[PDB]
Symmetry: C7
Subunit: 277 residues, 7 copies
């Protein structure tokens, strides 16, 4: 019915058997082998009793999970009981133990991925690299964290599909956390159709002035830049960039578009025109 | 005929032999080695009897499977019986045990893929990452789940061919579940042949208005966007995008086409024309 | 001459020697070491006798195979006999056993590919992923199965060359079975030179009607689609697709060509013309 | 309450039990097995007492970390206590020890990444390859170091997102330290539309003169170069380059732009014009 | 001088020593350790004698090979003799045996490639995937087999250079045998500049007729095909293909050229012209 | 204070204890276990004393290094002392030894990279593949050697940044030494716009003459070449090349430019003009 | 001074000590442990004496090599002596032996690359795949062999730089030997601007005639070919090829150029002109 009976029955059988053997030998002397064999077999029987009670208790309340647990536990208990009984009796100890050891190492390397996922889930439970809702990028996958488990994490990627990442990928690869950034950084390239480069400095400086006179820029770390990155026949390329304050994602788009339009306005104000890549 | 006879014949032979040896020694004292050897050899004979009964019982009802099982089980039983008998007799114990151990580890690493498939099938039976009929994408393969087994999963890919994925690929790679998405997300890029960028804001805003005034859009998480992503000589690129409600797959196509046509209509309404990439 | 003589010569020599030793000790007491040494050496001699009889029997009927088997078996038997004799005598047991164990693990990892091929051949004999004549695609190779063995499969690829695939590639990679598909799926893209997109809906719908009014289409799972996938200056791209009934391979080509010609006919009927990618 | 009580309670119980057993045997002689069993069980109980005191002491002041530590430590202590008690009693020693050993090697290979990160963090604590604030580039990631830990380093990449690099990547890959450079090096390519190559030497020399007559160049290691790297119909390519003094990052951009404009000025002074790649 | 002397010198020394020790102990009793030590040391001396005789016999007839064999065999014999003598004497048995075991496993993993080549050479000696003269393609290499060895195969590649392929590449990769094909297969693509697609069927059918009315085609497996694979503005692409009888390599070229010219003739007969990709 | 006291305190305690036990047993006989336990515990205490003296001596003169060494050494000493004391007492020997062994192999595989770097640093100390100042190229990195250590080498790459290469990369990859070359080799390709190829020989020969009549060419190994590598409509490509004497890096550039200009001069002298790729 | 003294000092000390102990026990009986300890410690001292003599002898004649050898040998000897002395005394045998074994396997896997290089150098000393001066191509590297060692080979690549290839790359990869070819093979492609393909056969045949009437062609294996590989609007591509006799490298260039010019001459003789790819 419970653990109490599942113990009491084998315990009373074992005490009965050892008390029988004691007065079977007192009034040919292999008390130790038989007593150890009885202890091993009774303990195996008690473990079987407890296992059946528990997964019968679990099915008296997620059901094929209970059947899989029952089958796997019966396999494991049969293996352990066979090894321990062959060692208690003394018949073919090293042979059966070697078989069991090579089976154990087969199973232990075959299960390196499940164990990796579990151990990496725990390691992530210690050094939290992200939290629920953060937009992360792990190797090839990227999206919003929607579930954190012990063997897998669940993301929502750019097409808004739920992705399932095994937790052993967060220990061997770098993790980008797009939700903990305190300032953003934009950079673009504008092509110019220009032959009189004598006004590439002026334009450049003016643009930088515009980027410092713009709200939503961050002048704390790096200054806005706009330099000539390559030249060619009636062609030039300006590389613009700046840092922006911590903003949303529609405001980032609006600021990018606004900076680009103001830059092209400054460029066309000096009589220059855009080039063709 | 059954397990009962397959046991009683060796059990009665063993009891006969040990009862013979007892009164062969009472009225030179190696009772333990001979008795352990008899137990080992009788147990091997009983296992052979039971194996033959079972795969003769299985062939008295998927036939080359039974022959393969018979051959593999005979190989394994010969190995185990040789090891155990050499250990019971005492002749070249460690030599034969070392040979058997290196053979076991050869077989145990050679079989890492079959064991990986089985263990990953069980792990998937616990944490179900998909179900029958779901459209998944696992690494390089993608399609509709049509069969779930213990060592392989079966998909139907985009050309409508049945693919057979070993289950050890669902533990080391990310799984995208296209059938559990609750809203979709579309994004496109429109090129414009424009020289007066002074109307890129207006157009943009108008398009966004259109995407919010459209049924089948999802305004719960992110707002529709339409920003200028790159500019060039008489050329510009608008990046449009939005989220859509949970819809089928022909309605997704229809909505994409409709959004694209309405956007081009708004663009041409402002006197702008499409560009050429 | 046979197994009978190959056994009764060493068996009679061993019985003679142990009967000699018994009355050599009865009328200095190392009966056990000498008897175990005699058993080991006689058993090694009997195994040599049986091996020579068998591969002499095999060469009295595929000949360099027999010579290779003879050489490999003599190597293995020399190794096993040396280990067992050094353990029976008692001279340098652990040294020679360690040498033999490191040689065994060298050979057991050096042979991981042959063992992988054999074990994967058996695993495929259980869960048959294809049969003789099927057109499969395994990773980088594809063709018609023309032979199925235990360590290799033989295909006929697209250039009609016989390919030899090691069977350990069918356990770590996905297998596409092009011969078990129950319906096909075609998809194409048509470019249009169009400036009045006001007739992209009509055309689209008409094409879909054509794909549903065509025999050899499969309306069981997905509906035919034809949507606008990208637009550009006097340019548009229609993505067409449908499912087809289970057909041959020349009928699939004919149906593709027919669908393409009918689609272009519908397109040109509305005054539109094809574009240039 | 503390370690003192957590020790004295089991120590006094053990001393009581061994003093009982001594006069239980003096006035059947298995003093050693029972005494060793009592020592093992008392030590396991004391370790449990100390563990509960410590992680109860830690929760009487970063809380789910304490719960995870408690669970992991209870798992480990149960494993160790089971092994040691089965070895003290003598029941199924080698079986349980083999099970525990294969479980230990499973866990020890499953945890190769966490251990790699920790050991590489220590190795980096010895041979410091960078410090806080340095701009490093490790394999595929690059940015400013913002945090240095034992199992992970934190960077700020080019988009100004915090990246989390596992410390086992700094032992197998090269690390570029962009903050310890003492002089910079610029190099560019200018295309020329030229048919009279008889003035490619002159131009070249003049440009080099310009690069040596420029402040912010470093003439300590290598001389400025400007050579003809490829020629073609009315086309040529000059490869320019030099070293610059240790400067900031906006001054590097300004110097690049200035050198490029001066070079194009020299080129156009000789009647040559820029070409088109 | 020979094996006879190399044995009867150590054998007579050993018999002399054991006969001395027997009457040294009969008229302090460590007969077994000294006798086993004498047997081990005499056997090591005999092995040294035999090794020197053999590689002196081999150098009395490919010479640096003999010197390398001598050095390697002396290294191995020193290792084995040191282990066995330390185990016979009894001084630091487990220490020296552990050193020797870790050295053996170092050497056994360092030599995984040589052993792989040898074992794969034997496996290829059983399942012959090609023979001398066959044109094979193994992974990245392709050419005519000009030599087959035990650790390497020799090919002649397309530039007519001798390539040396390690035999462990024929067990992990697929092998294409270009010399066992029984029929060939050609396929080509012809671009057409056509606006009236109303004659794409006719042309197609005619071409197929031409491919069936041609000798050197194989109508046993698949029928000749010619279908429209893609269309575009005044552009179309016909995909032609067929099987050819088993022919040489200059006849294959001639047949390809002939089929291509006849197809273009049929195409231009219908007033169509070739297009431009 | 020193090693002398750190030894003579535990040595005198141990001698006192064994002299006590001797006359505690002479006037119940477990002299060996208690004496071995005392030796082990005294030796552990002495090692602790010596460790504390040394890293207190090192901190009485590169400080966090000393703290890390102290912590790591205390961890290691606790592990070793626990193992040795549990083995001396006799309580749970095999259990604790198995735990320690699996921990040791965990740490020994987790530290394969640090050990690889150290062993490869030593191997490089024997077979010196470069020296300080040499310009090397190792796999993906290239630059001037600026520091050679035991676990890492330091380079200065093309952008003049200090790179830190782990020394385990110089044992698995090829190393190019750009500072030990004794002659250089240049090769270029010139396109020609030519329709009368009847003067491609002449030009070619003339160019070769020019390359042999030029100082700074090396006529010791290979002769200068200039051949026609591909032809096309009014287009041809000449592939030129030669060896140059051992020269600097600005002279190599000057020689390349000079050879290119002289070749184009010879080409235009024959009425040919350059083509357009 | 030499090996003689380095042996006769420890040998005389050991004989003195055992002769002392014998009459210390004759007129408490632990002769075996003390004698084995004395033998082990004397042997360790003798090995230290011999090591110091040898590397003092080597430094009395490539010097930092001797210091590295001295340090490494002292480390190894300390390890071996500690293990053997702890095993002779009997204090913490299995603990120290386990520590030493895990250290040995750490070092034995950390040194897999050095051992691979050495073993592959020996394997190459047996099956010589090239000799000094041969032009080989191993994987990604190619050049002339300029030095052959035991752990590395030295090449001279195409830029005439000395490359250093680890010898473990010649066992896992294919080796192309450009210096053992007996005939060469050239192949080229000529584009034609042709609309009347009725003269593609004639031209083709004529070209082949030219390739058979040319000296320096090899008509032993394959016949010269020239076939039409692809056609297009006013465009065709002829694929030419042949085998050439064993020639140098400037004669190969001359023959290529000559064949190309003669082919273009034949092509233009038939009124055809070259096309434009
Ligand atoms: C780097 C900042 C935070 C430090 C904590 C990270 C440490 C993680 C490692 C511990 C957890 C691993 C759990 C594995 C269990 C082993 C059994
Ligand atoms: C993450 C959400 C669900 C958690 C369950 C996943 C756990 C899977 C691991 C257990 C099953 C593995 C079976 C292997 C058997 C070992 C023998
Ligand atoms: C998934 C559908 C079918 C299930 C059967 C597949 C199971 C294969 C595994 C068993 C065979 C492996 C043979 C290896 C022998 C081991 C020794
Ligand atoms: C090839 C030319 C030079 C030969 C010397 C190279 C040999 C290197 C190997 C020896 C050094 C390795 C050190 C490792 C220590 C092992 C413990
Ligand atoms: C294939 C043609 C030549 C055959 C000889 C090749 C055999 C090479 C293997 C032997 C040498 C290996 C040396 C390793 C030493 C092992 C210890």
């Amino acid at each position: 019915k419970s653990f109490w009976g599942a113990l009491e029955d084998p315990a009373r059988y074992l005490v009965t058997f050892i008390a029988f053997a004691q007065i079977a030998a007192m009034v040919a002397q292999y008390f130790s082998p038989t007593v150890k064999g009885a202890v091993i077999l009774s303990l195996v029987w008690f473990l079987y009793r407890w296992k059946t009670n528990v997964i019968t208790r679990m099915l008296s309340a997620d059901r094929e999970k209970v059947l899989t647990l029952d089958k796997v536990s019966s396999v494991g208990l049969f293996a352990i009981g066979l090894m321990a009984s062959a060692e208690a009796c003394g018949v073919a100890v090293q042979s059966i133990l070697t078989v069991g050891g090579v089976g154990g190492v087969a199973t232990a390397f075959a299960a390196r991925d499940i164990l990796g996922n579990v151990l990496s889930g725990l390691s992530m439970q210690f050094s939290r690299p992200f939290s629920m809702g953060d937009t992360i990028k792990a190797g090839s996958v990227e999206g919003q964290v929607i579930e954190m488990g012990l063997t897998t994490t669940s993301l929502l990627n750019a097409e808004k599909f739920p992705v399932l990442v095994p937790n052993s990928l967060f220990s061997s690869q770098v993790i980008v956390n797009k939700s903990r950034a305190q300032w953003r950084a934009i950079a673009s390239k504008i092509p110019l159709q220009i032959d009189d480069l004598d006004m590439i400095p002026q334009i450049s400086n003016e643009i930088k002035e515009m980027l410092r006179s713009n709200t939503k820029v961050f002048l704390g770390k790096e200054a806005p830049h706009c330099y000539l990155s390559r030249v060619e026949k009636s062609f030039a390329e300006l590389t613009i960039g700046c840092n922006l304050i911590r903003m949303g994602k529609e405001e980032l788009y609006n600021t990018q578009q606004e900076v680009l339009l103001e830059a092209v306005k400054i460029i066309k104000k000096h009589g220059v025109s855009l080039g063709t890549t």
